[PDB]
Amino acid sequence: MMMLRIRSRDGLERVTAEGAHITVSQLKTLIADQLQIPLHKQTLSTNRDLLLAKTPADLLAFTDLTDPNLPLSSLNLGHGSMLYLAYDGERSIPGAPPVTPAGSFGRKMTVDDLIARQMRVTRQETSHCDSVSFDRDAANAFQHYVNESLAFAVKRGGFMYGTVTEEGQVEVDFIYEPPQQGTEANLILMRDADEEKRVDAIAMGLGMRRVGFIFNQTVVQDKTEYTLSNAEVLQAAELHAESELKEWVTAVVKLEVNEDGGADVHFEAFQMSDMCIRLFKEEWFETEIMPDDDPKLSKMKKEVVVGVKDLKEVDNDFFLVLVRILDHQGPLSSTFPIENRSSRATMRALKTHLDRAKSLPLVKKMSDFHLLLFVAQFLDVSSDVPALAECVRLQSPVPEGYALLIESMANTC
Amino acid sequence: KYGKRVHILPVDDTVEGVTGNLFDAYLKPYFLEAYRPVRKGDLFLVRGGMRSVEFKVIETDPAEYCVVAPDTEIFCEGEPVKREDEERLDDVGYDDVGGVRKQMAQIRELVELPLRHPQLFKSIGVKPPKGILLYGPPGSGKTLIARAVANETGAFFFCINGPEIMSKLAGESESNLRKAFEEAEKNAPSIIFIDEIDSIAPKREKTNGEVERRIVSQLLTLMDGLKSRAHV
Amino acid sequence: IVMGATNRPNSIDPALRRFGRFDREIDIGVPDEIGRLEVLRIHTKNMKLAEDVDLERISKDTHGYVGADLAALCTEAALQCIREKMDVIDLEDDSIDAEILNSMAVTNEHFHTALGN
Ligand SMILES: Nc1ncnc2c1ncn2[C@@H]1O[C@H](COP(=O)(O)OP(=O)(O)NP(=O)(O)O)[C@@H](O)[C@H]1O
Numbered sequence: 229m230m231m232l233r234i235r236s237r238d239g240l241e242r243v244t245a246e247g248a249h250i251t252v253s254q255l256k257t258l259i260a261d262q263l264q265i266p267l268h269k270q271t272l273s274t275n276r277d278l279l280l281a282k283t284p285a286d287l288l289a290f291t292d293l294t295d296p297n298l299p300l301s302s303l304n305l306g307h308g309s310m311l312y313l314a315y316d317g318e319r320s321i322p323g324a325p326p327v328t329p330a331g332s333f334g335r336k337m338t339v340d341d342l343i344a345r346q347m348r349v350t351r352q353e354t355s356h357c358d359s360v361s362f363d364r365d366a367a368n369a370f371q372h373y374v375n376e377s378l379a380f381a382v383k384r385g386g387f388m389y390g391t392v393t394e395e396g397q398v399e400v401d402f403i404y405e406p407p408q409q410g411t412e413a414n415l416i417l418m419r420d421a422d423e424e425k426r427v428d429a430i431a432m433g434l435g436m437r438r439v440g441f442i443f444n445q446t447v448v449q450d451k452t453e454y455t456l457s458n459a460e461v462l463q464a465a466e467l468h469a470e471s472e473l474k475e476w477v478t479a480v481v482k483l484e485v486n487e488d489g490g491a492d493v494h495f496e497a498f499q500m501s502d503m504c505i506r507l508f509k510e511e512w513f514e515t516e517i518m519p520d521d522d523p524k525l526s527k528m529k530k531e532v533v534v535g536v537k538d539l540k541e542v543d544n545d546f547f548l549v550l551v552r553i554l555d556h557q558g559p560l561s562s563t564f565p566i567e568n569r570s571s572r573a574t575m576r577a578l579k580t581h582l583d584r585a586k587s588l589p590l591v592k593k594m595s596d597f598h599l600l601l602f603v604a605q606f607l608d609v610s611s612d613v614p615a616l617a618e619c620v621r622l623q624s625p626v627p628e629g630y631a632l633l634i635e636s637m638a639n640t641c
Numbered sequence: 642k643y644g645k646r647v648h649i650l651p652v653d654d655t656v657e658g659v660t661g662n663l664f665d666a667y668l669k670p671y672f673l674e675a676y677r678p679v680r681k682g683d684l685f686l687v688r689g690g691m692r693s694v695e696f697k698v699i700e701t702d703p704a705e706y707c708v709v710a711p712d713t714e715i716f717c718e719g720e721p722v723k724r725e726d727e728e729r730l731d732d733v734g735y736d737d738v739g740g741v742r743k744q745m746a747q748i749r750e751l752v753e754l755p756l757r758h759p760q761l762f763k764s765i766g767v768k769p770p771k772g773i774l775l776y777g778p779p780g781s782g783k784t785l786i787a788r789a790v791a792n793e794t795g796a797f798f799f800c801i802n803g804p805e806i807m808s809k810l811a812g813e814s815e816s817n818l819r820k821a822f823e824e825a826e827k828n829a830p831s832i833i834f835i836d837e838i839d840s841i842a843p844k845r846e847k848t849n850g851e852v853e854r855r856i857v858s859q860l861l862t863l864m865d866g867l868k869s870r871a872h873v
Numbered sequence: 874i875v876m877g878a879t880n881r882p883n884s885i886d887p888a889l890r891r892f893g894r895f896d897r898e899i900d901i902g903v904p905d906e907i908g909r910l911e912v913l914r915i916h917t918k919n920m921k922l923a924e925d926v927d928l929e930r931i932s933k934d935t936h937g938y939v940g941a942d943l944a945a946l947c948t949e950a951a952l953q954c955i956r957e958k959m960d961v962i963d964l965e966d967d968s969i970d971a972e973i974l975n976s977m978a979v980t981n982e983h984f985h986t987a988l989g990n
């Protein structure tokens with residue numbers, strides 16, 4: 229009986245053998261039968277550098293104990309002796325006592341720490357964006373499409389793009405509608421990677437960026453007692469989390485009914501509170517909303533404090549901040565129909581739009597985001613699209629090549 | 642399990658007016674192939690000359706402990722740890738409470754035994770007592786004893802304060818207490834130290850206040866509900 | 874049916890004792906010797922206890938005790954029994970010996986000490 233210590237990369241173990249009279253082959257067999265280490269991986273040595281190798285050939289290079297024929301008695305091994313065993317892979321040596329992590333002493337919680345750590349809900353008073361200015365042409369076109377082509381029966385949505393000022397004021401320049409499917413109480417945006425890249429390239433060339441998202445509420449949704457539904461709030465929060473801008477604006481298109489019975493379409497722009505974006509980025513919101521779920525109150529996987537009332541379900545009005553709405557005539561028009569709509573944009577529509585604005589200058593003809601994106605469907609997103617967008621923004625004379633290509637593709641070759 | 646993604650960084654008080662580089666004259670020469678066992682957080686002192694430079698082990702891989710082998714690839718990673726790390730000098734232990742050896746014994750028998758040995762109480766069949774009410778002359782070591790017996794046992798701690806709850810406006814104390822209790826129960830075992838309980842639950846005759854009565858009633862209703870036997 | 878509860882019936886609103894509202898008043902007083910003996914027999918049904926337990930002596934010695942105080946007395950007796958065995962149990966080892974865990978039993982002396990305390 230002899231006890232031999234076995235040092236490895238994972239640490240240290242010990243083995244009890246009959247004695248030093250056996251050879252390295254018997255020691256390897258005992259190691260295989262006790263520590264369950266396969267024979268083809270075991271490599272024995274007396275040098276401490278054996279575990280510093282990174283190849284089985286390097287391990288076998290240490291032949292002082294690699295050979296199984298060598299007797300163990302010739303190595304003067306005794307009780308408590310040291311041996312080094314190397315094997316392929318990394319293992320967890322058993323017998324490890326529990327070890328506390330560093331710094332885990334004095335977990336003194338407090339009421340204030342509870343308030344800070346636990347998510348709460350409040351309606352922010354002043355948003356980062358003091359006021360958002362909407363393009364009059366784009367707003368008119370969007371309102372016309374919502375009121376006439378949809379009659380406030382199918383939900384429509386689009387990303388808002390524009391410039392952001394130092395004080396936070398945003399001038400809306402255009403709206404981009406990705407491919408999407410709309411219904412009464414939901415709107416699933418089948419966003420396209422290439423189309424979104426083209427839109428971003430246009431915005432970079434146009435010296436602007438994403439500033440918010442717009443959608444319309446149907447007649448039934450307007451009659452309901454909320455400003456936004458849970459699905460709309462979730463979509464807006466998701467898009468804000470995707471965005472890196474603090475001046476995000478969620479715009480609602482609502483068919484209000486006056487006291488005289490008339491139907492007036494209103495754009496209500498609100499900025500979501502940073503509490504909502506903090507909720508979404510921490511995965512508290514439930515992206516799964518059932519039809520039985522109440523659209524009045526938002527869905528959260530964990531209970532939060534809604535101001536003074538402790539309810540897991542949170543009213544959507546606690547997330548919105550009133551932002552003053554402004555109207556301006558920017559350098560971009562939106563007479564061209566927005567892409568991905570029910571009326572799919574085609575070459576005939578492009579020709580009709582060009583003929584309608586024939587009296588306007590060529591730069592003014594192409595001063596429409598939807599037209600620019602339709603051209604971008606046939607232009608290089610990396611070079612041609614940013615250059616064309618920059619030319620549109622600066623109102624500079626368009627290069628002859630771009631105009632010739634646009635005319636050729638708009639006149640059926 | 643010799644570490645791979647270890648992190649070794651020095652301390653501010655020893656790098657003030659440092660002689661210069663520590664990677665090639667203080668760290669590598671005395672810890673490459675040295676096979677010195679290292680545990681995360683240890684403040685170890687090394688010399689690469691006349692100046693002695695303390696070092697704090699910020700991170701190790703494996704996280705708990707390892708050995709400084711040549712496989713360790715980290716250098717002196719710039720940031721020196723300030724003395725503020727020792728400002729929270731492991732809060733309070735047991736040697737920092739002295740002079741009372743029977744009151745602390747009773748508190749230990751009432752707290753540390755139920756939270757670390759339910760087998761005895763289950764075998765006997767007795768229901769251990771929950772409520773404990775320290776009292777004495779002001780400034781005699783009550784909060785210190787509570788911190789000593791709650792930090793040494795390693796259980797979840799929750800330090801409610803009297804004026805801290807009272808300072809909040811009406812309609813929030815009733816919510817703060819309930820949230821505190823529901824959070825403490827969720828992390829069994831748990832200790833709820835309610836300092837200056839005389840402020841939030843005074844004698845009813847001595848107050849005659851509506852909000853005081855309401856908060857007292859809320860506290861009583863919550864306290865009667867601790868019968869979940871969830872080690873609170 | 875409405876069943877009130879109080880401590881001093883004088884302190885209640887005097888208008889609540891009129892005919893029809895609260896017309897029956899029952900006085901749950903302090904138990905006598907047999908009451909204390911029965912309370913102790915009810916409370917010490919689950920506890921392990923040696924055959925030496927003299928509940929009659931404990932009932933006679935306790936005067937002015939109510940049910941809650943007798944429950945507290947039984948709990949104190951159990952805690953004293955654990956504390957006397959504490960001198961051999963080590964807190965650092967959560968693996969308390971099974972035979973040790975089953976060799977602990979409350980006797981009359983622990984009850985007397987708890988009564989004194
Ligand atoms: N028995 C004690 N042993 C050691 N230090 C003590 C003791 N009693 C008091 N101290 C010291 O007293 C100082 C502050 O006393 P502290 O215990 O915080 O007051 P308190 O009695 O908890 N106050 P209050 O809750 O207002 O009654 C600390 O620095 C403690 O170290």
Ligand SMILES: [Mg+2]
Binds near residue numbers: 783784837
């Ligand atoms: Mg105190």
